[PDB]
Amino acid sequence: AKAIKRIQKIEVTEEDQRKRDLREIEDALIDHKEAILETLHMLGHMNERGVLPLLRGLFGQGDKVLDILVKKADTEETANTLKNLLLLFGTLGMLDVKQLEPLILKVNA
Amino acid sequence: AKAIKRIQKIEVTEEDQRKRDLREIEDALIDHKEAILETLHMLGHMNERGVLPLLRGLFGQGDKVLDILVKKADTEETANTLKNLLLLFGTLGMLDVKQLEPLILKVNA
Amino acid sequence: GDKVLDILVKKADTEETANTLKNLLLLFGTLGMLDVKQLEPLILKVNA
Amino acid sequence: KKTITINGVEMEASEEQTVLQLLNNSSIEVPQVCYHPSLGPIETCDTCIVSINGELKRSCSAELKDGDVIDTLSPDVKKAQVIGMDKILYNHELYCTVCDYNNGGCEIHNTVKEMKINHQSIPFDHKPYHKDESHPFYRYDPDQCILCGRCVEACQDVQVTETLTIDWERKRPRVIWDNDVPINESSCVSCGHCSTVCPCNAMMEKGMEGEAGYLTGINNETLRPMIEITKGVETGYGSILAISDMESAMRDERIKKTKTVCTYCGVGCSFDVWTKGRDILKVEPQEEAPANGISTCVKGKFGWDFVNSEERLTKPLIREGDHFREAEWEEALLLIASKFTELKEAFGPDSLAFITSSKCTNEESYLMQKLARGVIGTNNVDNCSRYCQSPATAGLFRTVGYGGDSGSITDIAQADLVLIIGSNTSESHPVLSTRIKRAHKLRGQKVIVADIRKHEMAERSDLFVQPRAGSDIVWLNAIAKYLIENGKADERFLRERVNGRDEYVKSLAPYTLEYAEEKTGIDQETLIQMAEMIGQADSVCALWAMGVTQHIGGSDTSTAISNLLLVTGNYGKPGAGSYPLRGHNNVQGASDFGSMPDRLPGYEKVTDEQVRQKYERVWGVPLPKEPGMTNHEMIEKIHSGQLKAMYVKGEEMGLVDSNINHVHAAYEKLDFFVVQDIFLSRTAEFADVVLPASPSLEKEGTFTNTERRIQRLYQVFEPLGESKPDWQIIMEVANKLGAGWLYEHPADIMEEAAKLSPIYAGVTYERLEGYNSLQWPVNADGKDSPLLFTERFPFPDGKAILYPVQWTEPKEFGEEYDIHVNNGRLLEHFHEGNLTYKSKGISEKTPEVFLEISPELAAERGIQDGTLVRLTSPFGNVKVKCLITDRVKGKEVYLPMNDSGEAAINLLTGSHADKDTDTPAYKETSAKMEILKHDGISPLPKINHRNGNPQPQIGVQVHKKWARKDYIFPGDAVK
């Protein structure tokens, strides 16, 4: 029963630590089993109603989808419309809505 | 064949109950196998079209992304534009759209 | 979320918010009766 | 008395002094930012302006006259409260959305919401001062300071440290420390009151900064523009405040608040612990706390970083030659069971010693004694109360009847006279002193101090005497002799409730006034003026500690104190009694549950045949008849080949028992050693099987504090790794031998003990829910006793027995050992530092152990500061560093026990002990002076709670604010 201070760590092997870390996920799976099955049902319904295949087609062929979109939308009209839209936000900042409030009220009568 | 009422519960061990709870998830996986493979394909396509890496970069470097955004957007112009935008909603409540309806119709002619 | 929603609805149930939101809906309806066809040249004359 | 009219409604008063007190009880809404109930009115916010009899005045400071007409809804009163709030928001940026103080309790945030204010007329202005992060525990944001002075009122009148002040003469008045000195360099005791009493984030504990919310993590470099953009866009406060309330609500998901009882001193401070996962954000004291309210010391509010230390033990240890190897729980539990039974059936149950801890709960002590008695079959059960509370128990058992305080801490603050005998109360039971100092400052309480060191309590006192070592009993008997001869003593009490007057009178014969002057060293002039004031006062509270306990005649001096109060009628009176300050968090609680080897739980001796059967009936094992051995005497049993094994839980007795040179040799002399500590301590090095325990926060249970207050714990976090709680380990250890104990939670252990214990007859976990507590003796129905011996004493006749005691000559070393070496506690360091030095901020104010020398002593010995000195004793030798200090006198140095090593005062302490209950005499040690160095790193730095200079004052000096010509009262502004 002498005085000692050295400590010897236990051998938690590569697969041992892995099986503990996996059990961590497996526990939260059980803890949220309720929501897991609920989400799976919802997801099954999304495929059932073509929502999932619709997205799959969208990403699988998105290269075409985007090219189709940008080419049609690069008109002079669209460019001006979108620029003027941005311009509108800026000019609607210079406006003093304080004096527009009573201006509205007189039109009401 | 005397009268007895005591009940002895069966020993559902820690791992036994776990394997039953896991089988619950494994069943809903089979039940929704169709949608699972569909979603995986769609997800593979999202990575294929840089959607997933684009989001990963966004969150991995979001600290910079946000700082970049707020610093550029904290102008006097932006602050006024956004405040006046909010002010517009309030004043568009005091407006009586009832009398604006026939006012529009006369301009049409 | 139970608190989050209760907080939101209680603060947002003002007379002001109710009128603002109703008039917003009213605006969509009245912007249908408008004939944007004649508003197009009306804009162009203001430009000069 | 007093009939009033609240907005037309007729009313009547019960006892309220102020209008605000009435409006609060009557549930009428009124803003009151600077009013804190524990602090009293300050008149610094001006948010409580009401129209009483037509006059616009602050309701917080408004005497409740008869026939007053209170108006709390007039357009003029509301308009005035508004003006006040605008001057509050002038010194507040308000960013709740991204502020850590937005948790549904920020008095500012909740008041703006209450006041229906959406546009402040006075915009915010940055204060020209910097934030002071110097202190490792709390910060000061001047830009967020609203000059409410709640912190100032707390530091001066509540904590009574007097560091916090407000410079009103400045352009922008701000909260200053001393003479506007940075907090680390100032006289800051680090209690944490200022942060508890601040209503907003101006005074905030650094553990919450960027940790409380979800948006709080954002760096200030990006969060500051985020705020500026928000201010520019926002319309009214109502909308953005509602969003902030949503983040505040989402905060409930991640933040947990758990009630706990402090594991530091025996004050019994109860408080909530705001934790997010494993990290602690803040210790939040709640107003309804029984023994402290909103009061804390440094340790209780900030000394919890030890729970998250790397030195923490997670997996049990087993000895393997030159090392400790990590081993599984079951394989270790089998090993201890194998040796225990092997030794039991070879040498006897008496060959197994069982040492409990005064840190462990009531249940833990009860089960440790149940394992030793009802499983092993021996009565060898003892805690650290042999050297700590043995004279404190024995002294009272021999005279009044119960081994505990005569009342609660509240009775100390109400007392007219407070007699303090040998107690460094400021740096041992701190929250207790913030009641004594508070009453001395506000109520003019008579305070008498009697010990060899001039500590904080001594300097803030009305009278201070310095008796010699082991001579307190002499002056105690002399005062009693003077009081009884001059008819000053309460004779009605002596006839009514006292048994044995004339017998005790005869024992005071050799204690003449002149005799005391020769022995103690107290001039008869002051000796007679202290005796005259003892008898002059209505109620006297006698507070003694180690300066009485750790002596050759420790129990004699204790008995002398109690019958001195008995002689002047200071028992069963609200505001008087004997108060032996219990040093450990659960030293009283452990003692109550049969931890004495002389008694079973409920203080019933192991000699009653009837009580031996009462416990045997419910345990099923014949309770041992052979009386056990005390913690002190079982050390000798090892050297004599009588003790084979020992089970010491959570106690460092191989560092705190008299002469550690002998107890170290005694440790390596036994066959089996099972230690149950949370860390690998000095005692744990000599162990064969180590069991990793779970600390205070990682378990639930009960703690009976100094005022015999049984409080309940709530599990803050679940065991770290595989560190099972102490009670669980004891149960598993008993089961591995063959006990079959079944307790689903610690509450089940209590109900088994509560039945058997007569004093704890009616103690239930439901009665201790939240901040509820009971004070034993508590009846079977639930009737507790805050004050002891109200109608009768625990003796057959109902009278108290006086104990004649003669001054036993204190055994002094002498010849070559002239410079006496004292021992005691520090304010921040709870012993060696196996909990406090782990909190790295506590290690900045105090980094190492020191030897306090006086300027008179450092002249005759030719010594300076930061020098190595060698104090040699006939029991050991120390390598301490000399600290020049103005507290000690003559040739009497002070060695505080804050080092578990070579400079420990337990090496020098002698084997000699008290002549009644085996109490090691630590305050009876002498040594010789040797020098090793002339210059080095000073043991105590400038950045300490003692080096600074306080600026005393009462209140906040609100008239200084009111003197400024910029200040205009909201009420007369409307006029």
Ligand SMILES: Nc1nc2c(c(=O)[nH]1)N[C@H]1C(S)=C(S)[C@@H](COP(=O)(O)OP(=O)(O)OC[C@H]3O[C@@H](n4cnc5c(=O)[nH]c(N)nc54)[C@H](O)[C@@H]3O)O[C@H]1N2
């Ligand atoms: N020379 C000298 N020596 C003295 C004294 C003196 O004045 N002079 N005073 C003496 C007296 S009166 C006393 S009682 C002793 C003090 O001695 P102790 O009662 O032993 O107190 P500590 O050393 O503070 O605590 C012991 C250990 O308990 C562990 N611990 C903390 N919380 C828990 C918990 O919940 N469970 C468990 N199982 N362990 C825990 C900590 O890691 C700590 O190291 O000192 C004595 N020593």
Ligand SMILES: Nc1nc2c(c(=O)[nH]1)N[C@H]1C(S)=C(S)[C@@H](COP(=O)(O)OP(=O)(O)OC[C@H]3O[C@@H](n4cnc5c(=O)[nH]c(N)nc54)[C@H](O)[C@@H]3O)O[C@H]1N2
């Ligand atoms: N912060 C903090 N609080 C603690 C502790 C800690 O280490 N830190 N430990 C706890 C424990 S284990 C205990 S038992 C208590 C101990 O605390 P109390 O006993 O107050 O604490 P001490 O520091 O021992 O103070 C005793 C004082 O008695 C005086 N004294 C010494 N010898 C004599 C004498 O001959 N005659 C007279 N009249 N006076 C004398 C000295 O001034 C000495 O400082 O505190 C407990 N509280």
Ligand code: SF4
């Ligand atoms: S301290 Fe309170 S009022 Fe001030 S910004 Fe933080 S949450 Fe808002």
Ligand code: SF4
């Ligand atoms: S520092 Fe003092 S005056 Fe300023 S907010 Fe904190 S408690 Fe109030």
Ligand code: SF4
């Ligand atoms: S001394 Fe420090 S911790 Fe104590 S009240 Fe003053 S500022 Fe707060």
Ligand code: SF4
């Ligand atoms: S050590 Fe005592 S005074 Fe300090 S926080 Fe703990 S119980 Fe309160």
Ligand code: FES
């Ligand atoms: S509460 Fe009355 S002035 Fe602040």
Ligand SMILES: [Mo+4]
């Ligand atoms: Mo103690």
